[PDB]
Amino acid sequence: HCPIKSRKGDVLHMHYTGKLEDGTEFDSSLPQNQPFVFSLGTGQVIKGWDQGLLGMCEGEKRKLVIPSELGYGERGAPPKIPGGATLVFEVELLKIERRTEL
Ligand SMILES: C=CC[C@@H]1/C=C(\C)C[C@H](C)C[C@H](OC)[C@H]2O[C@@](O)(C(=O)C(=O)N3CCCC[C@H]3C(=O)O[C@H](/C(C)=C/[C@@H]3CC[C@@H](O)[C@H](OC)C3)[C@H](C)[C@@H](O)CC1=O)[C@H](C)C[C@@H]2OC
Numbered sequence: 001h002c003p004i005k006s007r008k009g010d011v012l013h014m015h016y017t018g019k020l021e022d023g024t025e026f027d028s029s030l031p032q033n034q035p036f037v038f039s040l041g042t043g044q045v046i047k048g049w050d051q052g053l054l055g056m057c058e059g060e061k062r063k064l065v066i067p068s069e070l071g072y073g074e075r076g077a078p079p080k081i082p083g084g085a086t087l088v089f090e091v092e093l094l095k096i097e098r099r100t101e102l
Contacts, residue, residue, distance in 0.1 A: 002057035004096050008041030012053070013095035019088045026080040035094055046071050048087070056093045064089040 006012060013035045017028040029036050038044045040053060048066030056062065066087040068074070076083040 002060075004058075004098070006040055006054055006056040006093065006096055007098075008054075009099075010040050011037060011097040012040055012056075012093060013037050013097070014091055014093055016089050016091045019090075020081075021086050021088070049089075053091070053093075058093050058095060061090065061092045064091060 014037075015029050015035055017025060017030065019025050038049075041050050043050065046066065048064060048070035051070065052062065052064045052066070064087075066089065068076075068084050068086060071085065071087050072081050072083070074083045076085060081087070
């Protein structure tokens with residue numbers, strides 16, 4: 001059951017856990033139980049998120065495996081992310097907030 005699914009310009013509420021290749025976890029929203037909120041497809045987030053999160057239903061989970069060209073490239077994001085790194089995100093969509101009227 002999925003009456004609405006994510007499209008560009010939607011505001012998404014998401015839980016995530018990010019891991020590096022060696023399985024070590026570098027960030028997660030679950031411990032503080034505070035979902036991350038962003039607008040899809042506006043360039044607010046790394047490309048691998050904007051491209052990997054379309055057509056999603058609330059309640060759906062996805063595993064994203066993001067190569068560094070779609071992530072933080074050659075400079076990375078010190079201290080948690082080295083340059084050239086592949087990122088693994090496990091994500092869950094909690095809510096779609098979509099501007100309905102004009
Ligand atoms: C002034 C404070 C900064 C401001 C911080 C917040 C609102 C708090 C928010 C929870 C972020 C987290 O803070 C605990 C933390 O999330 C990470 O741990 C992480 O899991 C991650 O990779 N995420 C977060 C979840 C969405 C995907 C990705 C991201 O796209 O993040 C986005 C990101 C960094 C995009 C850059 C922007 C510049 C481009 O040039 C670059 O390159 C294209 C891509 C984040 C959300 C930015 O929009 C907003 C911010 O950065 C980063 C490893 C480090 C990051 O803190 C820095």
